Ligand binder design. Structure first.
Ligand SMILES: *[C@@H]1O[C@H](CO)[C@@H](O[C@@H]2O[C@H](CO)[C@@H](O[C@H]3O[C@H](CO)[C@@H](O)[C@H](O[C@H]4O[C@H](CO)[C@@H](O)[C@H](O[C@H]5O[C@H](CO)[C@@H](O)[C@H](O)[C@@H]5O)[C@@H]4O)[C@@H]3O)[C@H](O)[C@H]2NC(C)=O)[C@H](O)[C@H]1NC(C)=O
Ligand code: CA
Ligand code: ZN
Length: 431
């Protein structure tokens, strides 16, 4: 019944700076929610199935907001703890959860931060209200943050989506996975190690393995308790998409937002009467909310306009001149070198490693931890470097080094700009 959680997604100017336009970031937050939507719906939470998410409102900040003296997110150097405290200092009683997306390089390889939920005896996590806390601030602890930059390198959407579900996992009351039964990556068995760790793994994840996409036995039990005790206070029943969330969905022609948010002269905002709200205004044939192939003056862009830039294995996206959406770009040949000759292309996305290009698998070298050591599949004894004589027929003695922000040493840390595998664990006292 009450199985869907209404979200509120914000993006600062650094996130807008990376992607360029408001359409591109909206497509990012749409892709991120649809990612965690499929992960949670296909998870059996002790009998509670088909638990989903939905965006109730967005707030896309541009570089123009960086000069706002009342915007506390404008400072370039903001600590990850204070970044989440800024998100918490807002009233989010109208949303089950509230997230803010950024493109900051947090210290110690931190890719996100969120409050941990609990069935009782502890504040935070999913579905908290705005109340006075110990520090004297009226915070809403139903909040979390995510960043798409780590060690001066952007993280792919495959790892970004999992990180989004990781922090939401804490909001659902799941701690980090512990023990061999819930972290197969550190197991002494080749069968369980190939499947990788789970979503709530406390360290680095690649997203190219089986278990990295779904929760563990440890996490499902912990989340099922928070869902049994907390979701009923805030979740809503599955219904039609709401008008005014800034994303065009099924049943609406356009979607700019509400009155204090719609700057689109071609779309009725959500404050208009039923029958015309989220419906295309007369004389207008599209709205920028539908896609990038629509100008601000609400005309279809020409068949020569470039909508999506050329990626590592995703060709240019050219408009068709008849719809506001952009056609899906055709992918490049598979096993093509991407990410500076470090990874190959798997189904149109830069994933895996360069070892797969020649029928090999990634291995941990014997500081050479940020070098790529390949191995024959199922045989760990053949693990040699790319610049070795074994694979001299494929790599020809060249030594491929891992880019900054890549997993290293059996997913225990990340590589930095000085080619060092720095570990991620951080411990602090409890009150
Ligand atoms: C994206 O850009 C937009 C627009 O540029 C940003 O939106 C702005 O966000 C800021 C903060 O989130 C807003 O700043 C004021 O918001 C309220 C509007 O009146 C103010 O009340 C608020 O005052 C706060 O200041 C202190 C913060 O520590 C605090 O002492 C104040 O006290 C109040 O609350 C305490 C409990 O904490 C209570 O005990 C007191 O009695 C009192 O009620 C209060 O907390 C902010 O000064 C700003 O209005 C808003 N809009 C703008 C600038 O147009 C958005 O943040 C950006 N987001 C990102 C991710 O970049
Ligand atoms: Ca909508
Ligand atoms: Zn975590």
């Amino acid at each position: 019944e009450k199985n869907t959680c209404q979200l509120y997604i914000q993006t600062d100017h650094l996130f807008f700076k990376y992607y360029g336009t408001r359409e591109a970031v909206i497509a990012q937050i749409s892709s991120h929610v649809k990612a965690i939507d499929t992960i949670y719906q296909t998870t059996d939470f002790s009998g509670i199935r088909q638990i989903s998410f939905m965006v109730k409102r967005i707030r896309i900040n541009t570089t123009a907001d960086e000069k706002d003296p009342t915007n506390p997110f404008r400072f370039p150097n903001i600590g990850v703890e204070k970044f989440l405290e800024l998100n918490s200092e807002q009233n989010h009683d109208d949303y089950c959860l509230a997230y803010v997306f950024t493109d900051r390089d947090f210290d110690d390889g931190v890719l996100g931060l969120a409050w941990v939920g609990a069935p009782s005896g502890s504040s935070g996590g999913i579905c908290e209200k705005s109340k006075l806390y110990s520090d004297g601030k009226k915070k809403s602890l139903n909040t979390g943050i995510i960043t798409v930059q780590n060690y001066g390198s952007h993280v792919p959407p495959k790892v970004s989506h999992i990180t989004f579900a990781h922090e939401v996992g804490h909001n659902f009351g799941s701690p980090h996975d512990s023990g061999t039964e819930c972290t197969p990556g550190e197991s002494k068995n080749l069968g369980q190690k190939e499947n990788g760790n789970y979503i709530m793994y406390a360290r680095a994840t690649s997203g190219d393995k089986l278990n990295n996409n779904k929760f563990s036995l440890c996490s499902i039990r912990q989340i099922s308790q928070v869902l049994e005790k907390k979701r009923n206070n805030c979740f809503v029943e599955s219904g039609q998409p709401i008008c005014g969330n800034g994303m065009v969905e099924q049943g609406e022609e356009c979607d700019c937002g509400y009155s204090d948010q719609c700057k689109d002269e071609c779309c009725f905002d959500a404050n208009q009467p039923e029958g015309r709200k989220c419906k295309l205004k007369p004389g207008k044939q599209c709205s920028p909310s539908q896609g990038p192939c629509c100008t601000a003056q609400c005309a279809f862009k020409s068949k020569s306009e470039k909508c999506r830039d050329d990626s590592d294995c995703a060709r240019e996206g050219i408009c068709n001149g008849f719809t506001a959406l952009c056609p899906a770009s055709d992918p490049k040949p598979q096993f093509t070198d991407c990410n500076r000759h470090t990874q190959v292309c798997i189904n149109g996305q830069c994933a895996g490693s360069i070892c797969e290009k020649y029928g090999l698998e990634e291995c941990t070298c014997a500081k050479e931890l940020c070098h790529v050591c390949c191995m024959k599949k199922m045989d760990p004894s053949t693990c040699a470097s790319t610049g070795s004589v074994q694979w001299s027929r494929h790599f020809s003695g060249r030594t491929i080094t891992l880019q900054p922000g890549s997993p290293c040493n059996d997913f225990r840390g990340y590589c930095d700009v000085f080619m060092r595998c720095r570990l991620v664990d951080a411990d602090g006292p409890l009150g």
